[PDB]
Motif scaffolding. Structure first.
Motif, PDB file in Angstrom:
ATOM      1  N   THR A   1     -34.731  -8.784 143.651  1.00 10.24           N
ATOM      2  CA  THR A   1     -33.344  -9.324 143.699  1.00 10.24           C
ATOM      3  C   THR A   1     -32.716  -9.200 145.078  1.00 10.24           C
ATOM      4  OG1 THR A   1     -32.763  -9.006 141.373  1.00 10.24           O
ATOM      5  CG2 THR A   1     -30.971  -8.867 142.969  1.00 10.24           C
ATOM      6  N   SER A   2     -32.070 -10.276 145.502  1.00 10.02           N
ATOM      7  CA  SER A   2     -31.387 -10.309 146.781  1.00 10.02           C
ATOM      8  C   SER A   2     -29.969 -10.815 146.533  1.00 10.02           C
ATOM      9  CB  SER A   2     -32.122 -11.239 147.751  1.00 10.02           C
ATOM     10  OG  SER A   2     -33.448 -10.799 147.978  1.00 10.02           O
ATOM     11  N   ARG A  19     -33.959 -14.920 140.439  1.00 15.40           N
ATOM     12  CA  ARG A  19     -35.142 -14.408 139.754  1.00 15.40           C
ATOM     13  C   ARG A  19     -35.007 -13.064 139.036  1.00 15.40           C
ATOM     14  NH1 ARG A  19     -40.617 -14.518 143.312  1.00 15.40           N
ATOM     15  NH2 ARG A  19     -40.402 -16.695 142.619  1.00 15.40           N
ATOM     16  N   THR A  20     -35.434 -13.040 137.777  1.00 20.08           N
ATOM     17  CA  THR A  20     -35.470 -11.808 137.002  1.00 20.08           C
ATOM     18  C   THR A  20     -36.939 -11.650 136.649  1.00 20.08           C
ATOM     19  OG1 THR A  20     -35.082 -12.935 134.889  1.00 20.08           O
ATOM     20  CG2 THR A  20     -33.176 -12.061 136.017  1.00 20.08           C
ATOM     21  N   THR A  21     -37.468 -10.455 136.878  1.00 20.43           N
ATOM     22  CA  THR A  21     -38.871 -10.189 136.587  1.00 20.43           C
ATOM     23  C   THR A  21     -39.134  -9.034 135.651  1.00 20.43           C
ATOM     24  OG1 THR A  21     -38.762  -9.105 138.715  1.00 20.43           O
ATOM     25  CG2 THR A  21     -39.990 -11.159 138.576  1.00 20.43           C
ATOM     26  N   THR A  22     -40.317  -9.099 135.061  1.00 19.39           N
ATOM     27  CA  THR A  22     -40.895  -8.128 134.137  1.00 19.39           C
ATOM     28  C   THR A  22     -42.261  -7.862 134.778  1.00 19.39           C
ATOM     29  OG1 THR A  22     -39.879  -8.772 132.050  1.00 19.39           O
ATOM     30  CG2 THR A  22     -42.104  -7.884 131.984  1.00 19.39           C
ATOM     31  N   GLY A  23     -42.287  -6.959 135.751  1.00 20.15           N
ATOM     32  CA  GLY A  23     -43.539  -6.711 136.457  1.00 20.15           C
ATOM     33  C   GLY A  23     -43.706  -7.854 137.435  1.00 20.15           C
ATOM     34  N   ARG A  45     -24.890  -8.767 140.597  1.00 20.78           N
ATOM     35  CA  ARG A  45     -25.694  -7.861 139.798  1.00 20.78           C
ATOM     36  C   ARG A  45     -27.142  -7.676 140.285  1.00 20.78           C
ATOM     37  NH1 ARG A  45     -26.817  -9.614 135.181  1.00 20.78           N
ATOM     38  NH2 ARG A  45     -26.402 -11.814 135.679  1.00 20.78           N
ATOM     39  N   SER A  46     -27.575  -6.412 140.349  1.00 16.56           N
ATOM     40  CA  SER A  46     -28.942  -6.032 140.745  1.00 16.56           C
ATOM     41  C   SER A  46     -29.360  -4.820 139.905  1.00 16.56           C
ATOM     42  CB  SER A  46     -29.038  -5.674 142.237  1.00 16.56           C
ATOM     43  OG  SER A  46     -28.566  -4.361 142.509  1.00 16.56           O
ATOM     44  N   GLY A  47     -30.648  -4.740 139.589  1.00 15.61           N
ATOM     45  CA  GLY A  47     -31.143  -3.646 138.782  1.00 15.61           C
ATOM     46  C   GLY A  47     -31.492  -4.116 137.385  1.00 15.61           C
ATOM     47  N   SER A  48     -31.057  -3.359 136.392  1.00 18.85           N
ATOM     48  CA  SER A  48     -31.310  -3.688 135.001  1.00 18.85           C
ATOM     49  C   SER A  48     -30.409  -4.834 134.530  1.00 18.85           C
ATOM     50  CB  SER A  48     -31.038  -2.469 134.132  1.00 18.85           C
ATOM     51  OG  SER A  48     -30.851  -2.866 132.780  1.00 18.85           O
ATOM     52  N   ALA A  49     -31.014  -5.903 134.036  1.00 16.70           N
ATOM     53  CA  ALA A  49     -30.238  -7.033 133.553  1.00 16.70           C
ATOM     54  C   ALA A  49     -29.341  -6.575 132.409  1.00 16.70           C
ATOM     55  CB  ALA A  49     -31.167  -8.142 133.076  1.00 16.70           C
ATOM     56  N   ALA A  50     -29.906  -5.818 131.474  1.00 19.57           N
ATOM     57  CA  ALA A  50     -29.141  -5.331 130.328  1.00 19.57           C
ATOM     58  C   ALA A  50     -28.012  -4.409 130.771  1.00 19.57           C
ATOM     59  CB  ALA A  50     -30.052  -4.611 129.358  1.00 19.57           C
TER      60      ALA A  50
ATOM     61  N   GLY G 117     -31.232  -5.514 125.319  1.00 15.69           N
ATOM     62  CA  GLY G 117     -29.887  -6.055 125.270  1.00 15.69           C
ATOM     63  C   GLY G 117     -29.476  -7.106 126.280  1.00 15.69           C
ATOM     64  N   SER G 118     -30.400  -7.574 127.111  1.00 13.94           N
ATOM     65  CA  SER G 118     -30.042  -8.592 128.086  1.00 13.94           C
ATOM     66  C   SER G 118     -30.220  -9.971 127.463  1.00 13.94           C
ATOM     67  CB  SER G 118     -30.915  -8.466 129.341  1.00 13.94           C
ATOM     68  OG  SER G 118     -32.268  -8.797 129.070  1.00 13.94           O
ATOM     69  N   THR G 119     -29.365 -10.911 127.859  1.00 15.48           N
ATOM     70  CA  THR G 119     -29.456 -12.285 127.348  1.00 15.48           C
ATOM     71  C   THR G 119     -29.677 -13.273 128.492  1.00 15.48           C
ATOM     72  OG1 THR G 119     -27.015 -12.398 127.327  1.00 15.48           O
ATOM     73  CG2 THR G 119     -28.120 -11.999 125.235  1.00 15.48           C
TER      74      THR G 119
HETATM   75  B1  LIG Z   1     -33.097  -7.964 140.602  1.00 19.52           B
HETATM   76  O1  LIG Z   1     -34.159  -7.325 141.079  1.00 19.52           O
HETATM   77  O2  LIG Z   1     -32.070  -7.103 140.495  1.00 19.52           O
HETATM   78  C1  LIG Z   1     -33.475  -8.482 139.144  1.00 19.52           C
HETATM   79  C2  LIG Z   1     -32.343  -9.326 138.408  1.00 19.52           C
HETATM   80  C3  LIG Z   1     -31.270  -8.694 137.466  1.00 19.52           C
HETATM   81  C4  LIG Z   1     -30.345  -7.712 138.203  1.00 19.52           C
HETATM   82  C5  LIG Z   1     -30.394  -9.805 136.863  1.00 19.52           C
HETATM   83  N1  LIG Z   1     -33.916  -7.370 138.349  1.00 19.52           N
HETATM   84  C6  LIG Z   1     -34.667  -7.598 137.237  1.00 19.52           C
HETATM   85  O3  LIG Z   1     -35.002  -8.731 136.912  1.00 19.52           O
HETATM   86  C7  LIG Z   1     -35.161  -6.427 136.376  1.00 19.52           C
HETATM   87  C8  LIG Z   1     -36.311  -5.561 137.055  1.00 19.52           C
HETATM   88  C9  LIG Z   1     -36.095  -5.150 138.551  1.00 19.52           C
HETATM   89  C10 LIG Z   1     -36.926  -5.729 139.583  1.00 19.52           C
HETATM   90  C11 LIG Z   1     -36.760  -5.361 140.956  1.00 19.52           C
HETATM   91  C12 LIG Z   1     -35.757  -4.404 141.318  1.00 19.52           C
HETATM   92  C13 LIG Z   1     -34.917  -3.817 140.305  1.00 19.52           C
HETATM   93  C14 LIG Z   1     -35.086  -4.188 138.924  1.00 19.52           C
HETATM   94  N2  LIG Z   1     -35.787  -7.063 135.198  1.00 19.52           N
HETATM   95  C15 LIG Z   1     -35.088  -7.106 134.026  1.00 19.52           C
HETATM   96  O4  LIG Z   1     -33.971  -6.620 133.930  1.00 19.52           O
HETATM   97  C16 LIG Z   1     -35.605  -7.785 132.798  1.00 19.52           C
HETATM   98  C17 LIG Z   1     -36.864  -8.374 132.701  1.00 19.52           C
HETATM   99  N3  LIG Z   1     -37.215  -8.989 131.532  1.00 19.52           N
HETATM  100  C18 LIG Z   1     -36.383  -9.051 130.451  1.00 19.52           C
HETATM  101  C19 LIG Z   1     -35.121  -8.462 130.543  1.00 19.52           C
HETATM  102  N4  LIG Z   1     -34.777  -7.848 131.711  1.00 19.52           N
END
Ligand SMILES: *[B]([O])([O])[C]([C][C]([C])[C])[N]C(=O)[C]([C]C1=[C][C]=[C][C]=[C]1)[N]C(=O)C1=[C]N=[C][C]=N1
Ligand SMILES: *[B]([O])([O])[C]([C][C]([C])[C])[N]C(=O)[C]([C]C1=[C][C]=[C][C]=[C]1)[N]C(=O)C1=[C]N=[C][C]=N1
Lengths: 196, 204, 233, 244, 243, 250, 222, 244
Positions: A1-2, A19-23, A45-50, G117-119
């Motif tokens: 995330t940037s 971009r949001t990633t899962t690995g 927002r950065s970090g945990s999406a939830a 809990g994320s959407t």
């Molecule tokens: B970014 O890196 O912050 C990014 C987007 C988020 C803040 C909207 N983070 C994620 O996508 C996180 C993992 C992560 C990667 C790199 C640095 C910090 C955190 N992924 C998720 O939250 C995710 C993935 N799959 C389903 C639900 N949530």
């Protein structure tokens, strides 16, 4: 995330990748990390999406109740609420949040709230995994009181570099301009920023 | 270690023509040591039958629980609970303990008294319902049972035939499982009557 | 009238009075007289102890809160114990958490607030005791008068209890005089005894009947009884 | 404060009586009469429905006879709603007992429990007592057929024949007059109908104003059977017994 | 016995005097108000009376902004009105948080009616001596007017009025709709609807209004706001140039 | 603060009467008449929409409410009490039944639940009984069609037909005359309309009257298709128009 | 598991496979991963079966009660807020991964929720172990302005990518179409491309093959 | 009937709440105190009756500060006043803690309002026996408020309460008329000392001690401070002079 927020002459602009990633899998490539917690107070927002979503929804609820009773809140107040949630719950959250808002008396303001839950008011702020790669660039190219065009360009170049190096960042660059004039949404596609 | 592999045991149910069958082994052990060879795993409330495999203490507790619940149900509803309804009661009851589950593998069988339709169902330890039209298997020899059933089974078998089929499925699966066997009982259910037969099998 | 509005403290009378509180104040008047006065170096508490029979003791009326604070009571002893114990804690919390002696003025504020809570809620009753608090803090000598209504006032001198008006007049007269008894405790104490005697009538203050307390500049709040007060009778 | 509006439902009268219990009883006395008669081969429960109409659906009705267990049942006299609260807890105590000991609950144990609940509303809580009186008819392998009674006070006792509700004195005298230790369930049935028939405050005694139940151990079985009579069944027994 | 008039329990006639007396309290401020529905707006007019000269006229109001979309006017003592307002704001904020959309005018009305119904049944809670009129342009129902009372009652109106001289305002408005044959002021601009409202407020009351005698609230798609002394004057002038 | 009213507000009088419940029934008596009639293939419940002002919108106020897709209620007495009772009834039908057996409760049981809530407000500390009487009509697979009445005491009973409120006595009488065990649903609706006419003073039409039925399943009112065992709700509120069409054959 | 969601010009469609597994064993060959929250708001669930079913019915139940209380049609954003705040509360312990879609007064919607809990919002989505095969097809054939029929095909083909290429997915294809002005249409087993071939032999045993020790009639009646 | 005035949350037939009205009597029986809003702040003043010579002068302070920008003065039962300030102080800390910015005077006013109004909802508590005048400077100006025992409050140009509220209210109305352009902090301070000396006639029997405090954007920087020494004496004089 940037993600980053920059204050300029007319107010402030927020930018982020999508971009949001899962690995190494891109769960969402068209994510909107620029969230509105009030008419002229948005966040990055950065970090945990939830975690960040939950935090954002709560702040929004708070400012809405604040307005109902005491009118429009200051950007400093919005940062205080974010901080209160992030600090008091530091043990169960992974949220890197940038708060940006446009006030008429204060113009544009930026408060960054990193992991610990500490608050930092700055001219501009950058966060997210990709931010590490643009510390040099941003420090060398930032100037105070730039014009909307200059600012949009600063964010556009900075982020395309972040997106270039950080695999956790990518997709489209999104921006949100906050000024007395109102709110403006900007979007830049790969074919454009990739060749900057 | 695995609450579901301490006592051992199996249960299987099949649907036939205007009938249903449910069977179980009789073993109750403690790891390698066989302890009882009369531990039946099939109970019934009214015309609804329920077999329970898994940790014996929970198998017992759940039975006592459903007797309790079906009793109050009959007193209020003024009628006997039906297979379908019971299935739901079992599922909701299991999920109630979602984060501290009963280590059991329930199986429901019966004929709807009003529609006369045969019914069987399986559940995991937290309530997920598996409503199959052919058969349901449960226990420490469930793989073997799946194998037996998937081959031996065929639709609309008559009571007398369904009996041969379910019995062979149970018997041969149990003989490949160290924790099952030591006797078996089979129930052939029809709208009107229910026959219970004890099978002859290896005692090792 | 009154009879329909004095059932409990939670009820206001048609004129805006709180009879239960007023009734409590009455317990004070029925209490043995006690006096308080200070100069700029000391603060003295002279209390007339009351005895039940001639085979009984003259119940203690002076309690120490801290090394720099203490008070005399007139009214329900149990309530004085409750309130004094509360003050002991506040005086103590101040030292432990802030390594600071509690300002006499601030202790008055605490008592007022504690007393007030018992005059706005159902089920409770007001306190039935008056208190005179003396102390030496970072701003000198101090004397306070506490009323169950929650009213706490800072004075140069005063008295509460039966016939207390005698002493109070005497003090309001002797003011210009005792206020200057600095550097001389015995003179302040004597003035304290001459004040408390202005409220005598029944008998005369005796040795086991007299109780005095002093505090100031270089004098940790201390209590004197019997023999120790003989040189003042 | 509130104290002002507190009835103080659980205090003693200068004569050492419990006001609320006394008035609840007074309330019960106006309720349809219920009768319980114990024979050698079974038990009979009969009750008169208070207030009825041409449109009252009697087929789907129940207001005085309730099944607690498969061996225990009760006849109600008083507030139906209050009675249902107690009946449900009653049905639960039974199942708990059954789950704990794997044996049906002895009749008195269940009766003592409910009576204890009632007694509680008498000594603490500041709530009104339940305006209800029960006639318990049950069977267990320790005392065979049993007949009990409990009222708002939380007191209970056993009987060979008894009544609750309206005109109890009148009905009790009649029972104490034609009852005999060696009676038979069919004799009991008839006695029950006669008593009600003579203590009714209504014109005649029709079936649409009755609830009937018997707890017998049908010889051709060996187990206990409860039978809540259906309108038609009550109409029949009404003709035979010569009341048409 | 006679306490069936102090707390909310039934009187032998099956009445609740405390609820009836609370209704009496609603007229204590001697102010009247009314609401009408436009083509796509909702307007509420209310008398503004500032007796003391020592008062700051800008802080004397009985109209409230419940949410970005809900507006509420109160008939009754200010302390009870503010208690109802604070609650309604809290209720509206929470609803949005939990359900993801803005609480509808009619729903918030029901919610408050239920809260009032409770003070009606529980002895320790006194009813609030106020009548609440809620207005907005609901995203599903359009211009909306819902009012609740100390009895916990609530219903929606085509137009309504509250206060000491409520009956006169009502019958006035009734007559207009019997005539027009429609259930709303057929005007495209809220300015004319505000004018219609003030006009009839004058006919029924037989009184002329200055810019500081009224208080006006307007509800439109996505927003509810109140007019200023000057915004009102501009309104008063317009009506003047017609009579 | 804190409710310190932990004692009963309804107690026994020397005569054995429970004043508050008596008074509550009195409040119910003043209520607008409402009724219910059970046919062989349905049930009908109806009441009068006593608009409290012509400026009020009578639609926004339904006296007839759906509790479950096969059960509806109507009342006489204090509307606000009825409203909160309907909310609780709908919730209890879920919390105490659907969430357990995966199916809506049968009429008698739901009625039973409601009755319980009312009984409690008769004995719990600090409250007054509910000032309403309800008429609940529904259908369920094993019990068929049914109609009940629940009073402020918490007592309830099944009816072939009945009326409550203002002119209940007269209405009950008129029903006894017209009711029989062979009535078809339309016949009952008709009789319902006739009975309610004697009770309505002013206008009598589909806008001043509120009527609903419990009859056949309405697959058209389901909202979706694909699940064979789901055929739609048996509860259906009649339209202002549907009522008028029948008032013409009155 | 393979579940997908696809928006089309006048509504939204969701599909899923029908396999349930425990380790390498197929527990259910035809379970239903499509749930109904309200008549016009359906949900596709992946993860822990018991969990997806439970959370789906709970929110469904509350949604019904909320609908009755507000006299309004349920909105998809409400099902989404209730679901997400519930899942968030349980820090991921309730293994529910859902694709929630539907039509309501405000239009047609498509969302996804993860156990924590994320959407997320999009025009096309997929979740589950088949998620990657499905998404490969979606990223290859999706286009804006699809017709109902095109959407059914796209969604149905995405599920098939899962069935064929993902071991966690199999058997049949379930679909549910929600169009702006019509009833939602649930198509159970819209596709059944995996019918078992006729067995090579019948294993019906000659009666008496099984040795019986004892026999008796069971008493059902009370 | 009657009795409507013995319980706090009870509505009398005329829709009033007598206990609250009685509390007011307690407020009228108290010392007089005022508030004068000015061009960039507010001034507070109160009368302090010298019961005797024994009272240490200048000691028993009455005016109270909340946070660092709000001033509060009240008449009636003094202890009740402290209780209300304590609440306000918590109320303020809470607000600043979450929102960072010190609490706006209007917001602070509602806090006290809601709390005071709360004490007129239950019979288990008593209404406040005071009327409070408070205010301060904030993001948009100065604000002056007066809160009644009923929880009612409004913004004022000038306010007074207590024994001589009429004298004061009279003097205040004059100032309002003869200064449409607004008084000044410095001027309001002397003016206040005067209103107090005049309103003291309604108590001319006992000697008193004046107390003043002010919060002005220019004179105190928006912070609440007490008037002491020279500035105080200058005001006492301005008053003692015009009192003749
Ligand atoms: B970014 O890196 O912050 C990014 C987007 C988020 C803040 C909207 N983070 C994620 O996508 C996180 C993992 C992560 C990667 C790199 C640095 C910090 C955190 N992924 C998720 O939250 C995710 C993935 N799959 C389903 C639900 N949530
Ligand atoms: B899919 O992968 O999502 C699929 C479908 C389900 C969500 C309806 N998942 C499963 O079938 C799960 C996989 C699983 C196994 C172990 C822990 C957690 C998840 N299987 C089951 O839920 C299940 C239910 N009952 C019996 C056996 N397995």
């Amino acid at each position: 995330t940037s993600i980053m927020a920059v204050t300029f002459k007319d107010g402030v602009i927020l930018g982020a990748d999508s971009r949001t990633t899962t690995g190494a899998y891109i769960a969402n490539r068209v994510t909107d990390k620029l969230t509105r917690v009030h008419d002229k107070i948005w966040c990055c927002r950065s970090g945990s999406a939830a975690d960040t979503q939950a935090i954002a929804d709560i702040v929004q609820y708070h400012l809405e109740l604040y307005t109902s009773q005491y009118g429009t809140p200051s950007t400093e107040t919005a940062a205080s609420v974010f901080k209160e949630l992030c600090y008091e719950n530091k043990d169960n959250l992974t949220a890197g949040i940038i708060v940006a808002g446009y006030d008429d008396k204060n113009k544009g303001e930026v408060y960054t709230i990193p992991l610990g839950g500490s608050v930092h008011k700055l001219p501009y702020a950058i966060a997210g995994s990709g931010s590490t790669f643009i510390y040099g660039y941003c420090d060398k190219n930032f100037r105070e009181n730039m014009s909307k065009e200059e600012t949009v360009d600063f964010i556009k170049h900075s982020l395309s570099q972040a997106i270039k190096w950080d695999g956790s960042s990518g997709g489209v660059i999104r921006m949100v301009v906050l000024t007395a004039a109102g709110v403006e949404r900007l979007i830049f596609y790969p074919d454009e920023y990739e060749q900057l | 270690s695995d609450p579901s592999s301490i006592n051992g045991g199996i249960v299987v149910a099949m649907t036939g023509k205007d009938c249903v069958a449910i069977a179980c082994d009789l073993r109750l052990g403690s790891q390698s040591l066989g302890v009882s060879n009369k531990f039946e795993k099939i109970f019934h409330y009214g015309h609804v039958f329920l077999g329970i495999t898994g940790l014996a203490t929970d198998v017992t507790t759940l039975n006592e629980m459903f007797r309790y619940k079906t009793n109050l149900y009959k007193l209020k509803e003024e009628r006997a609970i039906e297979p379908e309804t019971f299935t739901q009661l079992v599922s909701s009851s299991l999920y109630e303990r979602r984060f501290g589950p009963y280590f059991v593998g329930p199986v429901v069988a019966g004929i709807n008294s009003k529609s006369g339709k045969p019914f069987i169902a399986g559940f995991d330890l937290i309530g997920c319902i598996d409503e199959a039209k052919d058969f349901i298997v449960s226990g420490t020899a469930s793989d073997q049972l799946f194998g037996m059933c998937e081959s031996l089974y065929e639709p609309n078998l008559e009571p007398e035939d369904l009996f041969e089929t379910i019995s062979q499925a149970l018997l041969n699966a149990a003989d490949r499982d160290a924790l099952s066997g030591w006797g078996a009982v089979v129930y052939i259910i029809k709208k009107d009557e229910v026959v219970k037969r004890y099978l002859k099998m290896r005692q090792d | 009238f009154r009879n329909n509005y004095d059932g409990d403290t939670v009820t206001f009378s048609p004129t805006g009075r709180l009879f239960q509180v007023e009734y409590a104040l009455e317990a004070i008047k029925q209490g043995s007289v006690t006096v308080g006065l200070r100069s700029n170096t000391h603060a003295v508490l002279v209390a007339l102890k009351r005895n039940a029979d001639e085979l009984s003791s003259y119940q203690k009326k002076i309690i120490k809160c801290d090394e720099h604070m203490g008070l005399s009571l007139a009214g329900l002893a149990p309530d004085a114990r409750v309130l004094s114990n509360y003050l002991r804690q506040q005086c103590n919390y101040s030292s432990l958490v802030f390594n600071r002696k509690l300002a006499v003025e601030r202790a008055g504020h605490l008592l007022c607030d504690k007393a007030q809570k018992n005059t706005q809620s159902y089920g409770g009753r007001p306190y039935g005791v008056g208190l005179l608090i003396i102390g030496y803090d970072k701003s000198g000598a101090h004397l306070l008068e506490f009323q169950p209504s929650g009213n706490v006032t800072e004075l140069y001198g005063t008295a509460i209890g039966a016939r207390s008006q005698g002493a109070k007049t005497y003090l309001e007269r002797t003011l210009d005089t005792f206020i200057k008894i600095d550097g001389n405790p015995d003179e302040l104490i004597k003035a304290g005894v001459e004040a408390i005697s202005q409220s005598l009538r029944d008998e005369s203050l005796t040795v086991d009947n007299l109780s005095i307390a002093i505090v100031g500049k270089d004098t940790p709040f201390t209590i004197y009884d019997g023999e120790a007060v003989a040189k003042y009778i | 404060g509130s104290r002002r509006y507190d009835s103080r439902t659980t205090i003693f009268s200068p004569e050492g009586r419990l006001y609320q219990v006394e008035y609840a009883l007074e309330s019960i006395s106006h309720a349809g009469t219920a009768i319980g008669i114990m024979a050698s081969d079974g038990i009979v429960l009969a009750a008169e429905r208070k207030v009825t109409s041409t449109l009252l659906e009697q087929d789907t009705s129940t207001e005085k006879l309730y099944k607690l267990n498969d061996k225990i049942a009760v006849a109600v006299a008083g507030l139906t709603a209050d009675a249902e609260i107690l009946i449900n807890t009653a049905r639960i105590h039974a199942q708990n007992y059954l789950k704990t000991y794997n044996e049906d609950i002895p009749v008195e144990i269940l009766v003592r429990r409910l009576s204890d609940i009632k007694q509680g509303y008498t000594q603490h809580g500041g709530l009104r007592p339940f305006g209800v009186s029960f006639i318990y008819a049950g069977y267990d392998d320790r005392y065979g057929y049993q007949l009990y009674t409990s009222n708002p006070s939380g007191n209970y006792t056993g009987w060979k024949a008894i009544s609750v509700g309206a005109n109890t004195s009148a009905a009790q005298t009649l029972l104490q007059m034609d009852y005999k230790d060696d009676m038979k369930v069919d004799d009991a049935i008839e006695l029950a109908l006669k008593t009600l028939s003579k203590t009714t405050d209504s014109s005649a005694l029709t079936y649409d104003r009755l609830e009937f139940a018997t707890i017998r151990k049908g010889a051709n079985d060996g187990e206990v059977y409860q039978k809540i009579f259906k309108p038609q069944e009550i109409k029949d027994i009404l003709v035979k017994t010569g009341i048409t | 016995a006679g306490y069936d008039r102090h707390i909310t329990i039934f009187s032998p006639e099956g009445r609740l005097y405390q609820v009836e007396y609370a209704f009496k309290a609603t007229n204590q401020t001697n102010i009247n108000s009314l609401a009408v529905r436009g083509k796509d707006c909702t307007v509420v007019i209310s008398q503004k009376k500032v007796p003391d000269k020592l008062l700051d006229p800008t802080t004397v109001s009985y109209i409230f902004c419940i949410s970005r979309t809900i507006g509420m006017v109160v008939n009754g003592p200010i302390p009870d009105a503010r208690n109802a307002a604070l609650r309604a704001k809290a209720e509206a904020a929470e609803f949005r948080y939990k359900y993801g959309y803005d609480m509808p005018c009619d729903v918030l009305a029901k919610r408050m009616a239920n809260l009032s119904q409770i003070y009606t049944q529980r002895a320790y809670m006194r009813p609030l001596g106020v009548i609440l009129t809620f207005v907005s342009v609901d995203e599903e129902l359009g211009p909306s007017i819902y009012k609740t009372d100390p009895a916990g009652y609530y219903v929606g109106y085509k137009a309504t009025a509250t206060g000491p001289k409520q009956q006169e305002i009502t019958t006035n408005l009734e007559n207009h709709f019997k005539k027009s044959k429609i259930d709303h002021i057929n005007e495209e601009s809220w300015e004319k609807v505000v004018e219609f409202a003030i006009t009839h407020m004058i006919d029924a009351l037989g009184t002329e209004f200055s810019k500081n005698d009224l208080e006006v609230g307007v509800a439109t798609k996505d927003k509810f706001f109140t007019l200023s002394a000057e915004n009102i004057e501009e309104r008063l002038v317009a009506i003047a140039e017609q009579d | 603060m804190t409710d310190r009213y932990s004692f009963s507000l309804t107690t026994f009088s020397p005569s054995g009467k429970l004043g508050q419940i008596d008074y509550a029934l009195t409040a119910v008596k003043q209520g607008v008449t409402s009724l219910g009639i059970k046919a062989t293939n349905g049930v009908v419940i109806a009441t009068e929409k006593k608009s409290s002002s012509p400026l009020a919108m009578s639609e926004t106020l339904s006296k007839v409410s759906l509790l479950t897709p096969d059960i509806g209620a109507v009342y006489s007495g204090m509307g606000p009490d009825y409203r909160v009772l309907v909310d609780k009834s709908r919730k209890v039908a879920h919390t105490s039944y659907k969430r357990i057996y995966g199916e809506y409760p049968p009429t008698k049981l739901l009625v039973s639940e409601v009755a319980k809530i009312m009984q409690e407000a008769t004995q719990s500390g600090g409250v007054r009984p509910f000032g309403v009487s309800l008429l609940i009509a529904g259908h369920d697979e094993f019990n068929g069609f049914s109609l009940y009445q629940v009073d402020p005491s918490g007592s309830y009973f099944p009816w072939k037909a009945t009326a409550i409120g203002k002119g209940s006595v007269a209405a009950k009488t008129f029903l006894e005359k017209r009711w029989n065990d062979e009535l078809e649903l339309e016949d009952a609706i008709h009789i319902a309309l006739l009975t309610l006419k004697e009770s309505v003073e002013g206008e009598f039409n589909g806008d001043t009257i509120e009527l609903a039925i419990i009859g056949d399943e309405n697959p058209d009112l389901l909202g979706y298709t694909g699940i064979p065992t789901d055929k739609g709700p048996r509860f259906r509120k009649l339209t202002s128009q549907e009522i008028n069409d029948r008032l013409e054959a009155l | 598991t393979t579940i997908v969601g696809v928006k089309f010009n006048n509504g939204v469609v969701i599909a899923a496979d029908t396999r349930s597994t425990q380790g390498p064993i197929v527990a259910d060959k035809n379970c239903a991963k499509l749930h109904r929250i309200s008549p016009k708001i359906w949900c596709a669930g992946a993860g822990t079966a018991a969990d997806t079913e439970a959370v789906t019915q709970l929110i469904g139940s509350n949604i019904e009660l909320h609908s009755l209380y507000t006299s309004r049609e349920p909105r998809v954003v409400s099902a989404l807020q209730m679901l997400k705040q519930h899942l968030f509360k349980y820090q991921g312990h309730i293994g529910a991964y859902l694709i929630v879609a539907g039509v309501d007064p405000t239009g047609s919607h498509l969302f996804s929720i993860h156990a924590h809990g994320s959407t997320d919002v999009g025009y096309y989505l997929s979740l589950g172990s088949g998620s990657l095969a499905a998404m490969a097809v979606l990223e290859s054939h999706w286009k804006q302005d699809l017709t109902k029929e095109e959407a059914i095909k796209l969604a149905s083909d995405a599920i098939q990518a899962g069935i064929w290429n993902d071991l966690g997915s199999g058997s049949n294809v379930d679909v549910c179409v929600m169009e702006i002005g019509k009833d939602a249409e649930y198509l159970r087993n819209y596709l059944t491309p995996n019918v078992r071939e006729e067995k090579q032999k019948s294993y019906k045993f000659p009666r008496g093959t099984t040795a019986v020790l004892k026999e008796s009639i069971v008493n059902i009646c009370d | 009937g009657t009795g409507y005035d013995l319980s706090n949350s009870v509505f009398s037939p005329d829709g009033r709440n007598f206990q609250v009205e009685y509390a007011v009597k307690a407020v009228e029986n108290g010392t007089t105190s005022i508030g004068i809003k000015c061009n960039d702040g507010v001034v507070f003043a109160v009368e302090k009756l010298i019961t005797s010579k024994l009272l240490v002068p200048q000691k028993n302070v009455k005016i109270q500060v909340v946070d660092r920008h709000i001033g509060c003065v009240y008449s009636g039962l003094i202890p009740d006043g402290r209780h209300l300030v304590n609440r306000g102080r918590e109320e303020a800390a809470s607000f600043k803690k979450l929102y960072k910015t010190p609490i706006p005077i209007p917001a602070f006013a509602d806090r006290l309002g809601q709390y005071v109004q709360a004490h007129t909802l239950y019979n288990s508590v008593r209404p406040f026996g005071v009327s409070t005048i408070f205010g301060g400077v904030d993001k948009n100006g100065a604000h002056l408020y007066m809160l009644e025992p009923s929880g009612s409050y409004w913004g004022y140009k000038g306010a007074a309460t207590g024994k001589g509220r009429q004298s004061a209210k009279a003097e205040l109305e004059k100032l309002v008329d003869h200064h449409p352009e607004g008084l000044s902090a410095r001027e309001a301070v002397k003016q206040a000392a005067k209103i107090i000396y005049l309103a003291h006639e309604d108590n001319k029997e006992k000697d008193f001690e004046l107390e003043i405090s002010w919060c002005s954007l220019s004179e105190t920087n928006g912070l609440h401070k007490f008037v002491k020494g020279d500035l105080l004496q200058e005001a006492i004089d301005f008053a003692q002079k015009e009192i003749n």
